[PDB]
Amino acid sequence: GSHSMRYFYTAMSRPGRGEPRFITVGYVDDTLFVRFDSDATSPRKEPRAPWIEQEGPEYWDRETQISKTNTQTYRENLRTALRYYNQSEAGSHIIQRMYGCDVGPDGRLLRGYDQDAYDGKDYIALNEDLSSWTAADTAAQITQRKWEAARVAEQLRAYLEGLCVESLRRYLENGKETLQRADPPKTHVTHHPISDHEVTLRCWALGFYPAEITLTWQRDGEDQTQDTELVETRPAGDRTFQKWAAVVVPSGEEQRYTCHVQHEGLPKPLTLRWEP
């Protein structure tokens, strides 16, 4: 169905421990496909999915140069940020950027993204219009003024409507065996008595891709959202993900509870129960 491509930058200063580190990772949906780390050998953009290995030397040279240039640019940006927030050169700080595009089933742009953070807080964001900016504070407003003056939004829009979607479409075709395959969750409910009076029912979802999933417990048909323990969806290490949802239920009432599972790989939402 719908797909995304996102690049994620992390630039981290470390006073007394050399120049700021710059890392880029690229994803299509929940699949890492390229990485760059300025602390490497030998820093280069490196493939992390088989389908990107098809790209020729020109691709890799260009992608590496972009990242090597960015390493320098973001060191400058970290120095500028100190000035914008009246901070000393003694402390460690982080700039992050995430940008990319979503496409629909027909491959057309659904929306574009470009957003930055400083020390884990929103800094500046390209608006959905791909023409204006939202600055989080008076520091980011200085950057906004610079970017408005240079018509940066217009350049980004050109990329997001063009190369972003064009390359993503190519990746989806080259990786169609995996990127265009949903793996539904394998599901089961486990039973763990806490006491004579109460038991834990845990609804498991394993081996699914992509990561998006909904697990919900109902008691007599009513969602138990406030009373459910939901763990963060977690990577298995084989591309797939795992998740569980747990409720504490009175002993002898287990059959009043039903777990409901929604995932792209399922033809319809699934309902399951404790099966002793």
């Binding site: 400058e76 940020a81 610079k146 940066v152 980004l156 990329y159 972003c164 064009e166």
Partner: peptide
């Protein structure tokens, strides 16, 4: 494929 925006600085 990445974008490179020349001269874009904070």
């Amino acid at each position: 494929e990445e974008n490179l925006l020349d001269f874009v600085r904070f």
